[PDB]
Amino acid sequence: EVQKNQVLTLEEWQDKWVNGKTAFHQEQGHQLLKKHLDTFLKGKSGLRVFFPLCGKAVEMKWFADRGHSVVGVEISELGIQEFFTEQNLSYSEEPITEIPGTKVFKSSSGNISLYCCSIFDLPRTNIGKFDMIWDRGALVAINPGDRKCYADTMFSLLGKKFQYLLCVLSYDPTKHPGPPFYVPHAEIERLFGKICNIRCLEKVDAFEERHKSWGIDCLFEKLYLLTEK
Numbered sequence: 001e002v003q004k005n006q007v008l009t010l011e012e013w014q015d016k017w018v019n020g021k022t023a024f025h026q027e028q029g030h031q032l033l034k035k036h037l038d039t040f041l042k043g044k045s046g047l048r049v050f051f052p053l054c055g056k057a058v059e060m061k062w063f064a065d066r067g068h069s070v071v072g073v074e075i076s077e078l079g080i081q082e083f084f085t086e087q088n089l090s091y092s093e094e095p096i097t098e099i100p101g102t103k104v105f106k107s108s109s110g111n112i113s114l115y116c117c118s119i120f121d122l123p124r125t126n127i128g129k130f131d132m133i134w135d136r137g138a139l140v141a142i143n144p145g146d147r148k149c150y151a152d153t154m155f156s157l158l159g160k161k162f163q164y165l166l167c168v169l170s171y172d173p174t175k176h177p178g179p180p181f182y183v184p185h186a187e188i189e190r191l192f193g194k195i196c197n198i199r200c201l202e203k204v205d206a207f208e209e210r211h212k213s214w215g216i217d218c219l220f221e222k223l224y225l226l227t228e229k
């Protein structure tokens, strides 16, 4: 209930990128994913992997380097450009014909495509189906009221068998209004429990010096693996 009425705008997010206020970004990449990556990919070849609200997530290159095709969606053209610049990847552009005024950025390698539009635009595209989702700073970045629509959008993107990897943050929601927002276990169950087997693989201290600026003094991260019932 606490953060329920928080409504951020796309322009606010784009402004963060313009202003360099991108402290959510992890240059060395996600350490829980790094730990479990081989287990998740064991026996797997040429998967399609989706990154909602992808920013310039370095982990997209982890999957592409391992032979999987990666699609991300990110509202900030600046963040997308920073991804290609930082990963030293050439790219070219095409329109997203269904959503006038927007573009998809395609790595020359053919392995990474970043849609520069809203995640909520995707059901009107032919983005298709995915074997795997990496969701970090995404479900937690969405306006709280938008979570059900987001969850339904995720389901629309999933193949019959899937591994949905989900990172959420645990902190006292009365101390920081978000983002990132507080998504408790019960909320995961509400959104994903009917369709998914839910495993919480990790719960680790995530508190860094930068988190003092949110007015909290404890922060934990949980890594979930959601799969078909």
Ligand SMILES: Nc1ncnc2c1ncn2[C@@H]1O[C@H](CSCC[C@H](N)C(=O)O)[C@@H](O)[C@H]1O
Pocket (backbone or CB within 6 Å): 010, 013, 014, 024, 025, 026, 052, 053, 054, 055, 056, 057, 073, 074, 075, 076, 079, 117, 118, 119, 120, 136, 137, 138, 141
């Ligand atoms: N509706 C929306 N559609 C697409 N991108 C959105 C969005 N709302 C917010 N964003 C983008 O979502 C990102 C959340 S911050 C997390 C970024 C990235 N997943 C990482 O792990 O580092 C921002 O880059 C923001 O610009």
